[PDB]
Amino acid sequence: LSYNEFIRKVVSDHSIQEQEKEIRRLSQIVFGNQNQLANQLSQIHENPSFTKIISNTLTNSPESFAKLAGSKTFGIKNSKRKQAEKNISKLVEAIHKYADAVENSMG
């Protein structure tokens, strides 16, 4: 309702939106579905304290959520699979940034 408040909201809204976009881009690479983690994102949005649990699973057991993009044949990962794996770290970071932005907007 105040000018400074409106500015803070604009910036806050913006950082949320930019992370959502990057999460979609990275999810496409990791899982082949830019909305693969829609459930988890809305869960985090509702309660950002769930971010640690979800992030740990993504880091250590990503195929709990879905099969990774690409394939692995007799232990040999093709190029799509290698790119999927190499983007998990940045997907986790984007989810942490999203959670931080949501957590900050709440106050």
PDB file of N, CA and C in Angstrom:
ATOM      1  N   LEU A   1       0.820  -1.204   0.000  1.00  0.00           N
ATOM      2  CA  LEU A   1       0.000   0.000   0.000  1.00  0.00           C
ATOM      3  C   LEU A   1       0.862   1.266   0.000  1.00  0.00           C
ATOM      4  N   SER A   2       2.101   1.148   0.476  1.00  0.00           N
ATOM      5  CA  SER A   2       3.048   2.267   0.491  1.00  0.00           C
ATOM      6  C   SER A   2       4.007   2.172  -0.698  1.00  0.00           C
ATOM      7  N   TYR A   3       4.646   3.277  -1.066  1.00  0.00           N
ATOM      8  CA  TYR A   3       5.545   3.245  -2.218  1.00  0.00           C
ATOM      9  C   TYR A   3       6.677   2.233  -2.031  1.00  0.00           C
ATOM     10  N   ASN A   4       7.415   2.368  -0.934  1.00  0.00           N
ATOM     11  CA  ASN A   4       8.533   1.476  -0.658  1.00  0.00           C
ATOM     12  C   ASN A   4       8.074   0.026  -0.569  1.00  0.00           C
ATOM     13  N   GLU A   5       6.872  -0.176  -0.038  1.00  0.00           N
ATOM     14  CA  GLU A   5       6.288  -1.510   0.047  1.00  0.00           C
ATOM     15  C   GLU A   5       6.024  -2.074  -1.334  1.00  0.00           C
ATOM     16  N   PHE A   6       5.488  -1.239  -2.219  1.00  0.00           N
ATOM     17  CA  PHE A   6       5.209  -1.660  -3.590  1.00  0.00           C
ATOM     18  C   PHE A   6       6.500  -2.058  -4.306  1.00  0.00           C
ATOM     19  N   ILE A   7       7.552  -1.261  -4.124  1.00  0.00           N
ATOM     20  CA  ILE A   7       8.850  -1.570  -4.716  1.00  0.00           C
ATOM     21  C   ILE A   7       9.354  -2.923  -4.225  1.00  0.00           C
ATOM     22  N   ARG A   8       9.265  -3.146  -2.918  1.00  0.00           N
ATOM     23  CA  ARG A   8       9.734  -4.392  -2.342  1.00  0.00           C
ATOM     24  C   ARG A   8       8.941  -5.556  -2.904  1.00  0.00           C
ATOM     25  N   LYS A   9       7.645  -5.349  -3.126  1.00  0.00           N
ATOM     26  CA  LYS A   9       6.820  -6.417  -3.669  1.00  0.00           C
ATOM     27  C   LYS A   9       7.193  -6.720  -5.120  1.00  0.00           C
ATOM     28  N   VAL A  10       7.341  -5.675  -5.938  1.00  0.00           N
ATOM     29  CA  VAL A  10       7.789  -5.825  -7.329  1.00  0.00           C
ATOM     30  C   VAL A  10       9.045  -6.702  -7.429  1.00  0.00           C
ATOM     31  N   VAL A  11      10.061  -6.344  -6.651  1.00  0.00           N
ATOM     32  CA  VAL A  11      11.349  -7.019  -6.676  1.00  0.00           C
ATOM     33  C   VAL A  11      11.184  -8.457  -6.204  1.00  0.00           C
ATOM     34  N   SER A  12      10.361  -8.633  -5.177  1.00  0.00           N
ATOM     35  CA  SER A  12      10.138  -9.939  -4.585  1.00  0.00           C
ATOM     36  C   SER A  12       9.430 -10.852  -5.574  1.00  0.00           C
ATOM     37  N   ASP A  13       8.329 -10.357  -6.134  1.00  0.00           N
ATOM     38  CA  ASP A  13       7.600 -11.045  -7.188  1.00  0.00           C
ATOM     39  C   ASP A  13       8.521 -11.421  -8.334  1.00  0.00           C
ATOM     40  N   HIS A  14       9.381 -10.480  -8.716  1.00  0.00           N
ATOM     41  CA  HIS A  14      10.295 -10.688  -9.831  1.00  0.00           C
ATOM     42  C   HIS A  14      11.286 -11.828  -9.583  1.00  0.00           C
ATOM     43  N   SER A  15      11.882 -11.879  -8.397  1.00  0.00           N
ATOM     44  CA  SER A  15      12.876 -12.910  -8.131  1.00  0.00           C
ATOM     45  C   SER A  15      12.219 -14.297  -8.040  1.00  0.00           C
ATOM     46  N   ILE A  16      10.976 -14.337  -7.565  1.00  0.00           N
ATOM     47  CA  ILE A  16      10.209 -15.583  -7.553  1.00  0.00           C
ATOM     48  C   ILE A  16       9.989 -16.056  -8.980  1.00  0.00           C
ATOM     49  N   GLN A  17       9.531 -15.139  -9.824  1.00  0.00           N
ATOM     50  CA  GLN A  17       9.227 -15.474 -11.202  1.00  0.00           C
ATOM     51  C   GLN A  17      10.467 -15.925 -11.979  1.00  0.00           C
ATOM     52  N   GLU A  18      11.596 -15.250 -11.782  1.00  0.00           N
ATOM     53  CA  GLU A  18      12.817 -15.653 -12.467  1.00  0.00           C
ATOM     54  C   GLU A  18      13.300 -17.053 -12.053  1.00  0.00           C
ATOM     55  N   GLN A  19      13.121 -17.418 -10.786  1.00  0.00           N
ATOM     56  CA  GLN A  19      13.518 -18.760 -10.351  1.00  0.00           C
ATOM     57  C   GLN A  19      12.587 -19.815 -10.926  1.00  0.00           C
ATOM     58  N   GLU A  20      11.290 -19.514 -10.967  1.00  0.00           N
ATOM     59  CA  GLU A  20      10.332 -20.452 -11.542  1.00  0.00           C
ATOM     60  C   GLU A  20      10.702 -20.751 -12.986  1.00  0.00           C
ATOM     61  N   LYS A  21      11.096 -19.723 -13.720  1.00  0.00           N
ATOM     62  CA  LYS A  21      11.499 -19.893 -15.109  1.00  0.00           C
ATOM     63  C   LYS A  21      12.753 -20.770 -15.224  1.00  0.00           C
ATOM     64  N   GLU A  22      13.761 -20.489 -14.409  1.00  0.00           N
ATOM     65  CA  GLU A  22      14.989 -21.272 -14.456  1.00  0.00           C
ATOM     66  C   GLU A  22      14.745 -22.717 -13.994  1.00  0.00           C
ATOM     67  N   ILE A  23      13.861 -22.905 -13.012  1.00  0.00           N
ATOM     68  CA  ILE A  23      13.500 -24.265 -12.583  1.00  0.00           C
ATOM     69  C   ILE A  23      12.840 -25.049 -13.731  1.00  0.00           C
ATOM     70  N   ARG A  24      11.972 -24.387 -14.493  1.00  0.00           N
ATOM     71  CA  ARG A  24      11.370 -25.034 -15.656  1.00  0.00           C
ATOM     72  C   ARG A  24      12.436 -25.424 -16.688  1.00  0.00           C
ATOM     73  N   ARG A  25      13.358 -24.504 -16.970  1.00  0.00           N
ATOM     74  CA  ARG A  25      14.417 -24.736 -17.954  1.00  0.00           C
ATOM     75  C   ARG A  25      15.306 -25.898 -17.538  1.00  0.00           C
ATOM     76  N   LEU A  26      15.714 -25.894 -16.276  1.00  0.00           N
ATOM     77  CA  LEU A  26      16.558 -26.970 -15.755  1.00  0.00           C
ATOM     78  C   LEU A  26      15.816 -28.310 -15.608  1.00  0.00           C
ATOM     79  N   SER A  27      14.527 -28.261 -15.275  1.00  0.00           N
ATOM     80  CA  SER A  27      13.736 -29.496 -15.127  1.00  0.00           C
ATOM     81  C   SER A  27      13.551 -30.199 -16.476  1.00  0.00           C
ATOM     82  N   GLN A  28      13.403 -29.401 -17.525  1.00  0.00           N
ATOM     83  CA  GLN A  28      13.375 -29.926 -18.883  1.00  0.00           C
ATOM     84  C   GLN A  28      14.659 -30.710 -19.173  1.00  0.00           C
ATOM     85  N   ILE A  29      15.802 -30.166 -18.759  1.00  0.00           N
ATOM     86  CA  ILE A  29      17.088 -30.826 -19.004  1.00  0.00           C
ATOM     87  C   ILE A  29      17.264 -32.078 -18.145  1.00  0.00           C
ATOM     88  N   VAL A  30      16.925 -31.970 -16.865  1.00  0.00           N
ATOM     89  CA  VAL A  30      17.128 -33.072 -15.930  1.00  0.00           C
ATOM     90  C   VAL A  30      16.124 -34.215 -16.170  1.00  0.00           C
ATOM     91  N   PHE A  31      14.851 -33.871 -16.370  1.00  0.00           N
ATOM     92  CA  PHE A  31      13.780 -34.868 -16.404  1.00  0.00           C
ATOM     93  C   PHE A  31      13.061 -34.968 -17.741  1.00  0.00           C
ATOM     94  N   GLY A  32      13.276 -34.010 -18.636  1.00  0.00           N
ATOM     95  CA  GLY A  32      12.542 -34.024 -19.892  1.00  0.00           C
ATOM     96  C   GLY A  32      11.128 -33.498 -19.726  1.00  0.00           C
ATOM     97  N   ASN A  33      10.842 -32.877 -18.584  1.00  0.00           N
ATOM     98  CA  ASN A  33       9.513 -32.300 -18.316  1.00  0.00           C
ATOM     99  C   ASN A  33       9.706 -31.051 -17.470  1.00  0.00           C
ATOM    100  N   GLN A  34       9.440 -29.890 -18.053  1.00  0.00           N
ATOM    101  CA  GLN A  34       9.752 -28.643 -17.361  1.00  0.00           C
ATOM    102  C   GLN A  34       8.886 -28.455 -16.109  1.00  0.00           C
ATOM    103  N   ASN A  35       7.792 -29.212 -16.013  1.00  0.00           N
ATOM    104  CA  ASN A  35       6.938 -29.148 -14.827  1.00  0.00           C
ATOM    105  C   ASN A  35       6.999 -30.412 -13.969  1.00  0.00           C
ATOM    106  N   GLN A  36       8.091 -31.169 -14.074  1.00  0.00           N
ATOM    107  CA  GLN A  36       8.215 -32.443 -13.351  1.00  0.00           C
ATOM    108  C   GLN A  36       7.962 -32.295 -11.840  1.00  0.00           C
ATOM    109  N   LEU A  37       8.493 -31.225 -11.258  1.00  0.00           N
ATOM    110  CA  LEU A  37       8.433 -31.053  -9.813  1.00  0.00           C
ATOM    111  C   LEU A  37       7.360 -30.067  -9.359  1.00  0.00           C
ATOM    112  N   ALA A  38       6.318 -29.885 -10.174  1.00  0.00           N
ATOM    113  CA  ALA A  38       5.216 -28.972  -9.824  1.00  0.00           C
ATOM    114  C   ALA A  38       4.666 -29.229  -8.410  1.00  0.00           C
ATOM    115  N   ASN A  39       4.447 -30.495  -8.065  1.00  0.00           N
ATOM    116  CA  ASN A  39       3.952 -30.825  -6.728  1.00  0.00           C
ATOM    117  C   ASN A  39       4.878 -30.273  -5.653  1.00  0.00           C
ATOM    118  N   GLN A  40       6.166 -30.560  -5.800  1.00  0.00           N
ATOM    119  CA  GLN A  40       7.152 -30.176  -4.799  1.00  0.00           C
ATOM    120  C   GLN A  40       7.293 -28.661  -4.699  1.00  0.00           C
ATOM    121  N   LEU A  41       7.204 -27.973  -5.833  1.00  0.00           N
ATOM    122  CA  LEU A  41       7.301 -26.508  -5.831  1.00  0.00           C
ATOM    123  C   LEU A  41       6.141 -25.868  -5.067  1.00  0.00           C
ATOM    124  N   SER A  42       4.936 -26.390  -5.269  1.00  0.00           N
ATOM    125  CA  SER A  42       3.771 -25.844  -4.578  1.00  0.00           C
ATOM    126  C   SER A  42       3.816 -26.182  -3.083  1.00  0.00           C
ATOM    127  N   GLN A  43       4.404 -27.330  -2.766  1.00  0.00           N
ATOM    128  CA  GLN A  43       4.591 -27.758  -1.381  1.00  0.00           C
ATOM    129  C   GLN A  43       5.557 -26.804  -0.673  1.00  0.00           C
ATOM    130  N   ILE A  44       6.650 -26.493  -1.360  1.00  0.00           N
ATOM    131  CA  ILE A  44       7.645 -25.561  -0.851  1.00  0.00           C
ATOM    132  C   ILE A  44       7.022 -24.179  -0.749  1.00  0.00           C
ATOM    133  N   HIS A  45       6.259 -23.796  -1.761  1.00  0.00           N
ATOM    134  CA  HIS A  45       5.611 -22.486  -1.734  1.00  0.00           C
ATOM    135  C   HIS A  45       4.747 -22.329  -0.483  1.00  0.00           C
ATOM    136  N   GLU A  46       4.018 -23.384  -0.152  1.00  0.00           N
ATOM    137  CA  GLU A  46       3.135 -23.397   1.009  1.00  0.00           C
ATOM    138  C   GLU A  46       3.919 -23.450   2.317  1.00  0.00           C
ATOM    139  N   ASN A  47       4.975 -24.250   2.329  1.00  0.00           N
ATOM    140  CA  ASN A  47       5.813 -24.360   3.506  1.00  0.00           C
ATOM    141  C   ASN A  47       7.266 -24.527   3.099  1.00  0.00           C
ATOM    142  N   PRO A  48       8.014 -23.414   3.023  1.00  0.00           N
ATOM    143  CA  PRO A  48       9.394 -23.482   2.537  1.00  0.00           C
ATOM    144  C   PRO A  48      10.331 -24.281   3.430  1.00  0.00           C
ATOM    145  N   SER A  49       9.900 -24.633   4.636  1.00  0.00           N
ATOM    146  CA  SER A  49      10.740 -25.495   5.468  1.00  0.00           C
ATOM    147  C   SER A  49      10.898 -26.912   4.871  1.00  0.00           C
ATOM    148  N   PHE A  50      10.077 -27.272   3.882  1.00  0.00           N
ATOM    149  CA  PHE A  50      10.223 -28.580   3.210  1.00  0.00           C
ATOM    150  C   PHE A  50      11.390 -28.617   2.206  1.00  0.00           C
ATOM    151  N   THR A  51      11.991 -27.460   1.938  1.00  0.00           N
ATOM    152  CA  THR A  51      13.039 -27.330   0.924  1.00  0.00           C
ATOM    153  C   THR A  51      14.246 -28.230   1.190  1.00  0.00           C
ATOM    154  N   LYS A  52      14.638 -28.355   2.451  1.00  0.00           N
ATOM    155  CA  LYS A  52      15.802 -29.163   2.778  1.00  0.00           C
ATOM    156  C   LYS A  52      15.588 -30.642   2.401  1.00  0.00           C
ATOM    157  N   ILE A  53      14.417 -31.175   2.735  1.00  0.00           N
ATOM    158  CA  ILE A  53      14.101 -32.585   2.482  1.00  0.00           C
ATOM    159  C   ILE A  53      14.018 -32.877   0.985  1.00  0.00           C
ATOM    160  N   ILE A  54      13.273 -32.042   0.279  1.00  0.00           N
ATOM    161  CA  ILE A  54      13.137 -32.170  -1.160  1.00  0.00           C
ATOM    162  C   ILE A  54      14.487 -32.034  -1.884  1.00  0.00           C
ATOM    163  N   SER A  55      15.309 -31.072  -1.462  1.00  0.00           N
ATOM    164  CA  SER A  55      16.617 -30.827  -2.078  1.00  0.00           C
ATOM    165  C   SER A  55      17.586 -31.976  -1.899  1.00  0.00           C
ATOM    166  N   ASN A  56      17.592 -32.556  -0.706  1.00  0.00           N
ATOM    167  CA  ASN A  56      18.424 -33.716  -0.398  1.00  0.00           C
ATOM    168  C   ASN A  56      18.064 -34.912  -1.271  1.00  0.00           C
ATOM    169  N   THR A  57      16.766 -35.140  -1.440  1.00  0.00           N
ATOM    170  CA  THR A  57      16.308 -36.222  -2.312  1.00  0.00           C
ATOM    171  C   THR A  57      16.726 -35.950  -3.753  1.00  0.00           C
ATOM    172  N   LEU A  58      16.618 -34.698  -4.183  1.00  0.00           N
ATOM    173  CA  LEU A  58      16.972 -34.354  -5.560  1.00  0.00           C
ATOM    174  C   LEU A  58      18.471 -34.545  -5.810  1.00  0.00           C
ATOM    175  N   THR A  59      19.273 -34.185  -4.809  1.00  0.00           N
ATOM    176  CA  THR A  59      20.729 -34.279  -4.879  1.00  0.00           C
ATOM    177  C   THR A  59      21.201 -35.719  -4.889  1.00  0.00           C
ATOM    178  N   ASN A  60      20.624 -36.520  -3.996  1.00  0.00           N
ATOM    179  CA  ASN A  60      21.126 -37.857  -3.721  1.00  0.00           C
ATOM    180  C   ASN A  60      20.320 -38.977  -4.396  1.00  0.00           C
ATOM    181  N   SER A  61      19.041 -38.740  -4.673  1.00  0.00           N
ATOM    182  CA  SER A  61      18.197 -39.756  -5.317  1.00  0.00           C
ATOM    183  C   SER A  61      17.209 -39.116  -6.286  1.00  0.00           C
ATOM    184  N   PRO A  62      17.716 -38.401  -7.301  1.00  0.00           N
ATOM    185  CA  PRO A  62      16.803 -37.700  -8.209  1.00  0.00           C
ATOM    186  C   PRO A  62      15.789 -38.596  -8.918  1.00  0.00           C
ATOM    187  N   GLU A  63      16.124 -39.861  -9.170  1.00  0.00           N
ATOM    188  CA  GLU A  63      15.178 -40.702  -9.904  1.00  0.00           C
ATOM    189  C   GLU A  63      14.031 -41.183  -8.990  1.00  0.00           C
ATOM    190  N   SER A  64      14.063 -40.799  -7.717  1.00  0.00           N
ATOM    191  CA  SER A  64      12.873 -40.909  -6.863  1.00  0.00           C
ATOM    192  C   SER A  64      11.718 -40.102  -7.444  1.00  0.00           C
ATOM    193  N   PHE A  65      12.026 -38.968  -8.079  1.00  0.00           N
ATOM    194  CA  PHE A  65      10.970 -38.115  -8.613  1.00  0.00           C
ATOM    195  C   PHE A  65      10.496 -38.590  -9.992  1.00  0.00           C
ATOM    196  N   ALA A  66      11.447 -38.939 -10.850  1.00  0.00           N
ATOM    197  CA  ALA A  66      11.156 -39.429 -12.192  1.00  0.00           C
ATOM    198  C   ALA A  66      12.450 -39.941 -12.784  1.00  0.00           C
ATOM    199  N   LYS A  67      12.350 -40.738 -13.842  1.00  0.00           N
ATOM    200  CA  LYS A  67      13.536 -41.163 -14.581  1.00  0.00           C
ATOM    201  C   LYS A  67      14.264 -39.941 -15.146  1.00  0.00           C
ATOM    202  N   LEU A  68      15.591 -39.941 -15.097  1.00  0.00           N
ATOM    203  CA  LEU A  68      16.352 -38.837 -15.681  1.00  0.00           C
ATOM    204  C   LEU A  68      16.239 -38.861 -17.201  1.00  0.00           C
ATOM    205  N   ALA A  69      16.355 -37.694 -17.823  1.00  0.00           N
ATOM    206  CA  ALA A  69      16.359 -37.606 -19.281  1.00  0.00           C
ATOM    207  C   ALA A  69      17.541 -38.385 -19.838  1.00  0.00           C
ATOM    208  N   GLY A  70      17.442 -38.798 -21.096  1.00  0.00           N
ATOM    209  CA  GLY A  70      18.489 -39.597 -21.711  1.00  0.00           C
ATOM    210  C   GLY A  70      18.390 -41.039 -21.254  1.00  0.00           C
ATOM    211  N   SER A  71      19.434 -41.825 -21.482  1.00  0.00           N
ATOM    212  CA  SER A  71      19.428 -43.183 -20.975  1.00  0.00           C
ATOM    213  C   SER A  71      20.823 -43.658 -20.633  1.00  0.00           C
ATOM    214  N   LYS A  72      20.861 -44.777 -19.917  1.00  0.00           N
ATOM    215  CA  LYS A  72      22.094 -45.422 -19.504  1.00  0.00           C
ATOM    216  C   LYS A  72      22.001 -46.892 -19.873  1.00  0.00           C
ATOM    217  N   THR A  73      22.827 -47.311 -20.824  1.00  0.00           N
ATOM    218  CA  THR A  73      22.772 -48.674 -21.335  1.00  0.00           C
ATOM    219  C   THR A  73      23.983 -49.470 -20.881  1.00  0.00           C
ATOM    220  N   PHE A  74      23.739 -50.441 -20.004  1.00  0.00           N
ATOM    221  CA  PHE A  74      24.790 -51.284 -19.438  1.00  0.00           C
ATOM    222  C   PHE A  74      25.874 -50.424 -18.794  1.00  0.00           C
ATOM    223  N   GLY A  75      25.444 -49.415 -18.042  1.00  0.00           N
ATOM    224  CA  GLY A  75      26.363 -48.524 -17.359  1.00  0.00           C
ATOM    225  C   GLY A  75      26.893 -47.372 -18.192  1.00  0.00           C
ATOM    226  N   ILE A  76      26.627 -47.391 -19.495  1.00  0.00           N
ATOM    227  CA  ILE A  76      27.081 -46.317 -20.376  1.00  0.00           C
ATOM    228  C   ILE A  76      25.995 -45.254 -20.537  1.00  0.00           C
ATOM    229  N   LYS A  77      26.246 -44.073 -19.984  1.00  0.00           N
ATOM    230  CA  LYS A  77      25.320 -42.947 -20.079  1.00  0.00           C
ATOM    231  C   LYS A  77      25.449 -42.251 -21.427  1.00  0.00           C
ATOM    232  N   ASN A  78      24.347 -42.051 -22.150  1.00  0.00           N
ATOM    233  CA  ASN A  78      24.446 -41.279 -23.389  1.00  0.00           C
ATOM    234  C   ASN A  78      24.523 -39.788 -23.074  1.00  0.00           C
ATOM    235  N   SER A  79      24.631 -38.963 -24.107  1.00  0.00           N
ATOM    236  CA  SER A  79      24.943 -37.549 -23.910  1.00  0.00           C
ATOM    237  C   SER A  79      23.824 -36.802 -23.187  1.00  0.00           C
ATOM    238  N   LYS A  80      22.586 -37.141 -23.526  1.00  0.00           N
ATOM    239  CA  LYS A  80      21.429 -36.534 -22.897  1.00  0.00           C
ATOM    240  C   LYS A  80      21.409 -36.836 -21.395  1.00  0.00           C
ATOM    241  N   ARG A  81      21.761 -38.061 -21.028  1.00  0.00           N
ATOM    242  CA  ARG A  81      21.808 -38.441 -19.621  1.00  0.00           C
ATOM    243  C   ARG A  81      22.912 -37.682 -18.887  1.00  0.00           C
ATOM    244  N   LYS A  82      24.065 -37.538 -19.531  1.00  0.00           N
ATOM    245  CA  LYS A  82      25.176 -36.820 -18.921  1.00  0.00           C
ATOM    246  C   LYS A  82      24.805 -35.354 -18.690  1.00  0.00           C
ATOM    247  N   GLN A  83      24.131 -34.725 -19.651  1.00  0.00           N
ATOM    248  CA  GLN A  83      23.667 -33.348 -19.452  1.00  0.00           C
ATOM    249  C   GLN A  83      22.628 -33.258 -18.337  1.00  0.00           C
ATOM    250  N   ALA A  84      21.741 -34.250 -18.247  1.00  0.00           N
ATOM    251  CA  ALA A  84      20.745 -34.267 -17.181  1.00  0.00           C
ATOM    252  C   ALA A  84      21.440 -34.244 -15.824  1.00  0.00           C
ATOM    253  N   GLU A  85      22.392 -35.162 -15.646  1.00  0.00           N
ATOM    254  CA  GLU A  85      23.109 -35.284 -14.380  1.00  0.00           C
ATOM    255  C   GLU A  85      23.891 -34.016 -14.043  1.00  0.00           C
ATOM    256  N   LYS A  86      24.503 -33.401 -15.051  1.00  0.00           N
ATOM    257  CA  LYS A  86      25.337 -32.222 -14.822  1.00  0.00           C
ATOM    258  C   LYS A  86      24.521 -30.971 -14.532  1.00  0.00           C
ATOM    259  N   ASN A  87      23.200 -31.077 -14.578  1.00  0.00           N
ATOM    260  CA  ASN A  87      22.377 -29.911 -14.290  1.00  0.00           C
ATOM    261  C   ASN A  87      21.590 -30.038 -12.996  1.00  0.00           C
ATOM    262  N   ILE A  88      21.729 -31.174 -12.317  1.00  0.00           N
ATOM    263  CA  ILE A  88      21.045 -31.377 -11.051  1.00  0.00           C
ATOM    264  C   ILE A  88      21.501 -30.349  -9.997  1.00  0.00           C
ATOM    265  N   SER A  89      22.811 -30.131  -9.886  1.00  0.00           N
ATOM    266  CA  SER A  89      23.333 -29.142  -8.944  1.00  0.00           C
ATOM    267  C   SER A  89      22.666 -27.758  -9.121  1.00  0.00           C
ATOM    268  N   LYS A  90      22.573 -27.279 -10.360  1.00  0.00           N
ATOM    269  CA  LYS A  90      21.990 -25.959 -10.583  1.00  0.00           C
ATOM    270  C   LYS A  90      20.474 -25.973 -10.362  1.00  0.00           C
ATOM    271  N   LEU A  91      19.820 -27.104 -10.620  1.00  0.00           N
ATOM    272  CA  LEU A  91      18.389 -27.217 -10.335  1.00  0.00           C
ATOM    273  C   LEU A  91      18.142 -27.091  -8.820  1.00  0.00           C
ATOM    274  N   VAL A  92      18.951 -27.779  -8.022  1.00  0.00           N
ATOM    275  CA  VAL A  92      18.865 -27.648  -6.566  1.00  0.00           C
ATOM    276  C   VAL A  92      19.070 -26.181  -6.117  1.00  0.00           C
ATOM    277  N   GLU A  93      20.056 -25.501  -6.692  1.00  0.00           N
ATOM    278  CA  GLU A  93      20.311 -24.110  -6.309  1.00  0.00           C
ATOM    279  C   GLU A  93      19.133 -23.215  -6.642  1.00  0.00           C
ATOM    280  N   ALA A  94      18.504 -23.455  -7.784  1.00  0.00           N
ATOM    281  CA  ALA A  94      17.387 -22.616  -8.197  1.00  0.00           C
ATOM    282  C   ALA A  94      16.191 -22.829  -7.273  1.00  0.00           C
ATOM    283  N   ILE A  95      16.017 -24.059  -6.801  1.00  0.00           N
ATOM    284  CA  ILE A  95      14.947 -24.358  -5.858  1.00  0.00           C
ATOM    285  C   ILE A  95      15.216 -23.684  -4.511  1.00  0.00           C
ATOM    286  N   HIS A  96      16.472 -23.667  -4.072  1.00  0.00           N
ATOM    287  CA  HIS A  96      16.826 -22.964  -2.834  1.00  0.00           C
ATOM    288  C   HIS A  96      16.573 -21.456  -2.973  1.00  0.00           C
ATOM    289  N   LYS A  97      16.926 -20.885  -4.122  1.00  0.00           N
ATOM    290  CA  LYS A  97      16.666 -19.458  -4.373  1.00  0.00           C
ATOM    291  C   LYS A  97      15.172 -19.147  -4.406  1.00  0.00           C
ATOM    292  N   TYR A  98      14.399 -20.010  -5.062  1.00  0.00           N
ATOM    293  CA  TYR A  98      12.947 -19.899  -5.084  1.00  0.00           C
ATOM    294  C   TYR A  98      12.383 -19.909  -3.662  1.00  0.00           C
ATOM    295  N   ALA A  99      12.802 -20.891  -2.870  1.00  0.00           N
ATOM    296  CA  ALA A  99      12.360 -21.003  -1.478  1.00  0.00           C
ATOM    297  C   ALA A  99      12.720 -19.778  -0.644  1.00  0.00           C
ATOM    298  N   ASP A 100      13.934 -19.262  -0.824  1.00  0.00           N
ATOM    299  CA  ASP A 100      14.375 -18.064  -0.115  1.00  0.00           C
ATOM    300  C   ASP A 100      13.520 -16.862  -0.480  1.00  0.00           C
ATOM    301  N   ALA A 101      13.183 -16.746  -1.763  1.00  0.00           N
ATOM    302  CA  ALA A 101      12.399 -15.611  -2.239  1.00  0.00           C
ATOM    303  C   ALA A 101      10.978 -15.700  -1.701  1.00  0.00           C
ATOM    304  N   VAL A 102      10.422 -16.907  -1.687  1.00  0.00           N
ATOM    305  CA  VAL A 102       9.097 -17.124  -1.122  1.00  0.00           C
ATOM    306  C   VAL A 102       9.113 -16.818   0.376  1.00  0.00           C
ATOM    307  N   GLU A 103      10.109 -17.357   1.070  1.00  0.00           N
ATOM    308  CA  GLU A 103      10.258 -17.156   2.506  1.00  0.00           C
ATOM    309  C   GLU A 103      10.394 -15.674   2.848  1.00  0.00           C
ATOM    310  N   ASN A 104      11.064 -14.926   1.980  1.00  0.00           N
ATOM    311  CA  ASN A 104      11.269 -13.505   2.228  1.00  0.00           C
ATOM    312  C   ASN A 104       9.993 -12.711   1.976  1.00  0.00           C
ATOM    313  N   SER A 105       9.210 -13.132   0.991  1.00  0.00           N
ATOM    314  CA  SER A 105       7.990 -12.417   0.638  1.00  0.00           C
ATOM    315  C   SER A 105       6.946 -12.532   1.741  1.00  0.00           C
ATOM    316  N   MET A 106       7.042 -13.591   2.541  1.00  0.00           N
ATOM    317  CA  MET A 106       6.104 -13.817   3.640  1.00  0.00           C
ATOM    318  C   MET A 106       6.286 -12.777   4.749  1.00  0.00           C
ATOM    319  N   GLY A 107       7.398 -12.046   4.712  1.00  0.00           N
ATOM    320  CA  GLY A 107       7.654 -10.990   5.677  1.00  0.00           C
ATOM    321  C   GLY A 107       8.741 -10.018   5.255  1.00  0.00           C
TER     322      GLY A 107
END
